[PDB]
Design a protein around this nucleic acid. Structure first.
Lengths: 171, 126, 732
RNA sequence: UGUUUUUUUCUGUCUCGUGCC
């Protein structure tokens, strides 16, 4: 779930970047460093909206590299356990369902799915229906789910869904 | 221990600012509009494109004034910040569905008091 | 156990997976579905005619359902019931049509049941814009319309509501009929009311409330899908034009970049020409694609007049404006996007079909077994001298002299080559020593570049000048392209045959085997092994499952036409494992039969070896009677099955004019003299044989008479091609 | 209508005596 918080970071700037475009160069380096990455503390970062201020560059002793502890106002996406969101189904397989929560892909197994939703391997598009064939769930459909677990695979978040609670399907 | 169902989060995340699907959608759209201009600039990555096409399929309302109105009519209540995002994004039909999906609403408020809010949210949708 | 000890053959069970057999009533439906879906866009099976083709498909499906018939089993054994050699893709096409018909029938039954349940629920709820359960019957009956039926069912589900507890403009049916007929029979809501009055009776205070409902009704209507379906799919002049970035990125490599301003490409170029579809798909993947019919601007204008009022005096004008707005909303919802998606799906299907056809053609061209045996038929076969050199630049070139019985006799190396900058005698001496070491029957040299060709020519000249082909005569070294031997050298068979050998020896062995028995090599490979050889670049864009199925069907047909040697797959590893692509003898059944033969030590005594020893079931024996062959009864090693053995013996006796007394083995004149050469052909009449088969036998022998005569005259006939010598372009 | 080579920072112990700024 997306949020807007204030973060901090420092980047070393090589002395070749000194000049009238110092602040512009610092901003450009900041943009291509903290966009799209992920951390286990704050979660996955989408992008940066604006920068608060530029700190005082403390030149290191014996080294021309100077660090700028910049504080930027960026957004972050850190889903937690128990949250309910609305995602889209990407692929339907007998092992389980595949979805895509923005910068995440979760996964629901057949055990989580109730017994009413059977398999349709005979039909060309992998789909799940009921006995009466009234409700149909397939790919490219806005299907909800519940985040019952979380995981970070070395700055690569991958949660797990569930389909036990009622009112989880077509709106 | 981290479970949003029981309204618990780390200290850093407790002081965060909630965002709605339409809000993040328009923020990313404006960022794309700014970045596409000013040639000789590093183009967007696949993360930006996937987030855009993910948030564009759940934009209940395009007008920014709709976002302002729906946040203003909701902040007047005594619900926490976490209850401002999920309830305004999912837009459930009846109060029973909202209470079932979010266990925090069970016993926190009356039935008609939440049904009227859900009806207002549904009407605010474009 | 179910695959090997099953009542029905493996091929029959595998073909009719979705539809487990065909019933008497379902056979006609399956045949009709196959005929309707046989060739819609391109011309296929137009050979068999419309009604004749439909009858043949129905007969083949009925035979497959009853006797567990298969593709080759029904194509050859049922030549009368199906197209009599109309095309190679006869049994496989019939099986695919039957499976499609069964799947369509099952889907229609499910849709009808769902519609009936929904109608019952609506009657229970509202019976205690209405909700009527009348479209369920139409959906159930609409078996041919798969996509249209699914769209209609989804629209009905979304309109009625789909909930399972446990007056605005023209009507949808009238609008659909007016659009389909091209004349607006029904106008909009011809009433004095306008959108101002209709937007107050929901609670929105906006005039667009009814437009959304009208658009939802129009999009979720089977009639609209049927009217729009095939309007642009039938003809769509896709204009190929690279974009700003596509022009430089494609570099004229894809369909959307080859023609800078080459537009107006109709459905023929994409469907019939699979290369164009593959190029469009590849270009449309990353950079961009130019796929636009550009014919709507005039197809969408005619619909605008229909469903709208003609007068304009407030009530009439308001009704016309509301109808136009509703039509525009419906078109924006599921009018342009639906047509574009249908066109894209049709283009993808055409590209996949073209790729599959190209793969099948390549498999047919490269799979025909055309070895180069002695005299183009001392000892059985010829000694293939597989010479697979690495460089011919002072490096050891593999040269194996394998025999004609699917085995390698010996080999040797030739490190000396023309290494030495100026040495024109060391290579000649090495070649002479290698030729004198053994007595090969033919030379199979490979090639990689000009140097390899020069080395091969020098070796051939040295062999011919000094009579090094056999040590007593000149042997012509037949050129062999390094295409199959290189792949077969590093295969499972190559590794098993020789483990502590260099790759040159394996390549030489593979080249020798490929020029002695291509069928043995094809049957003794995983089919993995077949997928290694690329049939065409367009096959990659299309699904590889269709290409694999086509290759498997072609291999099975070739094996059935050429037959399988029972004794060849008993002790010789080279000619073993050839019971996987038989008509009715699946891979599991073939493996079980091979294991039983290896354990019990049973040989190919006759055609009834698997029926008498209890190794194969009656259905398996009947379906695989025309593919199993033995070394020795007289008609065992041929296409004559046990059912036609008596007829074949009687025909041979009549042709030879010999005595008739229990002719199975004892009288050898009509059998041996007839097999040696044609004794008498005018004695056996087609009409008399057909009458005898009809009176006694329960089947006409008009088409099977020629096959029986050929089997009696020639046993173990090979369906492979002849030895194809490399050409100039082919050699290069 | 041809032309033979590619591997690299090692490393040593504890004790005593003598001479020099």
């Amino acid at each position: 779930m997306f949020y807007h918080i204030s973060l901090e970071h420092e980047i070393l700037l090589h002395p070749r970047y000194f000049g009238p475009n110092l602040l512009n160069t610092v901003k450009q380096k900041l943009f291509t460093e903290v966009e799209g990455t992920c951390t286990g503390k704050y979660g996955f970062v989408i992008a940066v909206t604006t920068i608060d201020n530029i700190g005082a560059g403390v030149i290191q002793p014996g080294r021309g590299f100077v660090l700028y502890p910049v504080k930027y106002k960026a957004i972050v996406f850190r889903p937690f356990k128990g949250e309910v969101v609305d995602a889209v189904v990407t692929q339907v397989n007998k092992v389980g369902l595949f979805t895509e929560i923005g910068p995440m892909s979760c996964f629901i197994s057949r055990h989580s799915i109730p017994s009413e939703m059977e398999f349709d391997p005979n039909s060309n598009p992998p789909c799940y229906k009921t006995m009466d064939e009234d409700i149909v769930i397939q790919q490219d459909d806005e299907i909800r789910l519940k985040i019952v677990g979380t995981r970070v695979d070395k700055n690569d978040i991958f949660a797990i869904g569930s389909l036990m609670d009622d009112y989880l399907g077509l709106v | 221990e981290e479970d949003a169902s029981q309204l618990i989060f780390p200290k850093e995340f407790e002081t965060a600012e909630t965002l709605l699907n339409s809000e993040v959608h328009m923020l990313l759209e404006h960022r794309k509009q700014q970045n596409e201009s000013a040639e000789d600039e590093q183009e967007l990555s696949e993360v930006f494109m996937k987030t855009l096409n993910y948030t564009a399929r759940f934009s209940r309302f395009k007008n920014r004034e709709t976002i302002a109105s729906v946040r203003s009519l909701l902040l007047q209540k005594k619900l926490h910040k976490f209850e401002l995002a999920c309830l305004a994004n999912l837009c459930p039909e009846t109060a029973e569905e909202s209470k079932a999906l979010i266990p925090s609403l069970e016993g926190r408020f009356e039935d008609e008091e939440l049904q009227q809010i859900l009806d207002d949210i549904q009407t605010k949708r474009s | 156990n179910e695959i090997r000890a099953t009542d029905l053959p493996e091929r029959f069970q595998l073909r009719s997976i979705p539809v487990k057999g065909a019933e008497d009533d379902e056979l006609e439906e399956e045949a009709d579905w196959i005929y309707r879906n046989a060739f819609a866009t391109p011309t296929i099976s137009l050979s068999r005619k419309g009604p004749s083709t439909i009858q043949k498909i129905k007969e083949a499906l009925g035979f497959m359902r009853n006797q567990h018939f298969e593709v080759p089993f029904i194509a050859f054994y049922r030549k009368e019931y199906v197209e009599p050699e109309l095309h190679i893709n006869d049994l496989w096409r019939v099986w695919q049509w039957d499976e499609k018909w069964t799947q369509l029938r099952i889907r229609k039954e499910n849709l009808t049941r769902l519609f009936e349940k929904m109608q019952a629920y609506q009657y229970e709820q509202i019976s205690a814009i209405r909700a009527l359960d009348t479209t369920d019957m139409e959906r159930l009956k609409d078996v041919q319309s798969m996509d249209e039926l699914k769209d209609v069912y989804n629209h009905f589900l979304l309109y009625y509501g789909r909930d399972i507890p446990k007056k605005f403009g023209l009507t949808p049916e009238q609008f659909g009929e007016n659009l389909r007929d091209s004349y607006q029979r029904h106008e909009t809501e011809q009433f004095p009311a306008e959108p101002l009055e209709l937007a107050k009776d929901t609670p929105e205070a906006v005039l667009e409330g009814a437009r959304y409902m009208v658009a939802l009704q129009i999009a979720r209507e089977p009639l609209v899908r049927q009217v729009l379906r095939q309007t642009f799919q039938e003809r769509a002049k896709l204009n190929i034009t690279p974009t700003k970035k596509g022009r430089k990125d494609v570099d004229e490599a894809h369909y959307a970049y080859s023609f800078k301003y080459l537009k107006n490409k109709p459905v023929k170029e994409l469907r019939d020409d699979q290369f164009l579809k593959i190029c469009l798909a590849e270009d449309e993947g990353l950079l961009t694609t130019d796929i636009s019919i550009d014919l709507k601007g005039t197809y969408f204008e005619e619909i605008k007049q229909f469903y709208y009022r003609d007068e304009f005096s407030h009530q009439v004008q308001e009704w016309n404006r509301q109808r136009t707005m509703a039509i525009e909303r419906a078109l924006q919802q599921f009018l342009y996007v639906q047509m574009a998606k249908e066109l894209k799906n049709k283009l993808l299907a055409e590209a996949k079909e073209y790729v599959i056809k190209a793969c099948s053609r390549k498999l047919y061209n490269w799979l025909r077994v055309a070895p180069y045996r002695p005299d183009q038929q001392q000892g059985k076969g010829i000694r293939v001298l597989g010479i697979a050199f690495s460089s011919a630049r002072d490096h050891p070139v593999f040269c194996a002299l394998v025999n004609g019985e699917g085995e390698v006799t010996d080999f040797l190396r030739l490190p000396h080559f023309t290494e030495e900058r100026e040495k024109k005698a060391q290579d000649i001496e090495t070649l002479k020593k290698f030729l004198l070491n053994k007595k090969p029957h033919v030379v199979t040299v490979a090639g990689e570049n000009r140097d390899a060709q020069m080395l091969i020519e020098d070796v051939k000249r040295i062999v011919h000048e000094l009579d090094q082909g056999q040590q007593l005569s000149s042997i012509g070294v037949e050129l062999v392209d390094n295409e199959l031997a290189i792949l077969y050298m590093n295969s499972k068979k190559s590794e098993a045959e020789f483990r502590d050998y260099p790759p040159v020896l394996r390549q030489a062995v593979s080249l020798a085997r490929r020029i002695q028995d291509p069928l043995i090599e094809f049957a003794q490979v995983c089919s993995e092994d077949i997928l290694c050889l690329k049939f065409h670049p367009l096959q990659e864009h299309v699904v590889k499952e269709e290409l694999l199925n086509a290759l498997y069907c072609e291999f099975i047909n070739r094996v059935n036409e050429v037959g399988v040697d029972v004794n060849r797959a008993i002790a010789h590893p080279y000619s073993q494992a050839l019971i996987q692509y038989v008509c009715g003898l699946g891979p599991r059944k073939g493996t079980h039969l091979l294991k039983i033969l290896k354990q019990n030590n049973t040989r190919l005594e006759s055609r009834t070896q698997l029926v008498t020893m209890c190794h194969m079931g009656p259905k398996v024996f009947m379906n695989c009677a025309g593919f199993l062959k033995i070394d020795t009864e007289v008609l065992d090693g041929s296409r004559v099955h046990p059912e036609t053995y008596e007829w074949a013996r009687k025909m041979a006796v009549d042709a030879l004019e010999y005595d008739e007394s229990a002719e199975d083995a004892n009288p050898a004149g009509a059998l041996e003299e007839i097999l040696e050469n044609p004794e008498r052909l005018k004695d056996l009449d087609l009409d008399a044989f057909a009458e005898e088969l009809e009176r006694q036998g329960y089947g006409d022998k008009h088409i099977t008479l020629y096959d029986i005569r050929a089997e009696l005259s020639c046993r173990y006939k090979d369906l492979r091609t002849a030895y194809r010598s490399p050409n100039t372009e082919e050699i290069f």
